[PDB]
Amino acid sequence: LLKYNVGDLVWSKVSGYPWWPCMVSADPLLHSYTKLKGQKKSARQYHVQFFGDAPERAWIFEKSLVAFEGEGQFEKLCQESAKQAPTKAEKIKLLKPISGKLRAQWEMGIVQAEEAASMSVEERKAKFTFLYVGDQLHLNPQVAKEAG
C-alpha cells in the first residue's frame, strides 16, 4: 500500500533547505518512483521533482514528505520543524522567511504546485513532468513560458 504515486504533490524537507513544493515522478534512468533503501521497510524513498524555475530532482525519504494542499501549510510546517531543532540558532533559521534566489524560486515553484493541485492527476502529470534529453533536465515549454 504505497502512500504516494506518480503525479501526487508533496512538500519535501531536505537538510539545509526550507520545505519545498514537489511532485512524485518516475526516475528517467531507473524508471522507478519509489524504492527501499537497504531493503529496510521503514526507509522508503520517493523520486520527486522540485517545483521552480531552475528545476531539480531527488530521491527523498518518505519520512521527510508531507502531502501538498497549498502554501497555507508552509508556516505550520516550519513551526513543527522548529519544535524539534537542536539550538535557538536552528529555530531562527527555520522560522526566518526564505530570501535571495531561493525565495524567488520557492515562490515561482509554489505557483506551479498550486496550479497542479487544481488539475487531474493526468493533467498535472502532462503539464509539469520534466522532459529529459541525455544529461539535460528540461522544463515543459509552456511551463518555461509561464516562468520566463
Q: Which residues bind ligand A1H7X (CB under 6 A)?
A: 14, 17, 20, 50, 52-56, 58, 105, 109
Residue 70 CA, chain-centre distance (Å), reads 12
Residue showing the smallest CB distance to ligand A1H7X in the complex? 52
| Cα distances (Å, whole numbers) of residue 106 to 18, 49, 54, 110, 141 | 9, 13, 10, 6, 20
- Closest CB to ligand A1H7X among residues 7, 139: 139
CB 113 within 8 A of CB 23: yes
Describe the crossing of helices 101-117 and 121-128 by its angle, rounded to 10 degrees. Answer: 140
Q: In angstroms, what is the minimal distance from the CB of 105 to ligand A1H7X?
A: 4
Alpha-carbon gap, residue 71 to 74, rounded angstroms: 5
- Closest CB to ligand A1H7X among residues 7, 55: 55
- Closest CB to ligand A1H7X among residues 1, 148: 148
- Closest CB to ligand A1H7X among residues 58, 82: 58
Q: In angstroms, what is the minimal distance from the CB of 20 to ligand A1H7X?
A: 4
Q: Which long-range contacts (CB under 8 A, 24 or more apart) does 116-120 make?
A: 116/9, 116/23, 117/9, 117/68, 117/69, 117/70
- Closest CB to ligand A1H7X among residues 120, 131: 131
Q: In angstroms, what is the minimal distance from the CB of 1 to ligand A1H7X?
A: 27
Q: In angstroms, what is the minimal distance from the CB of 51 to ligand A1H7X?
A: 6
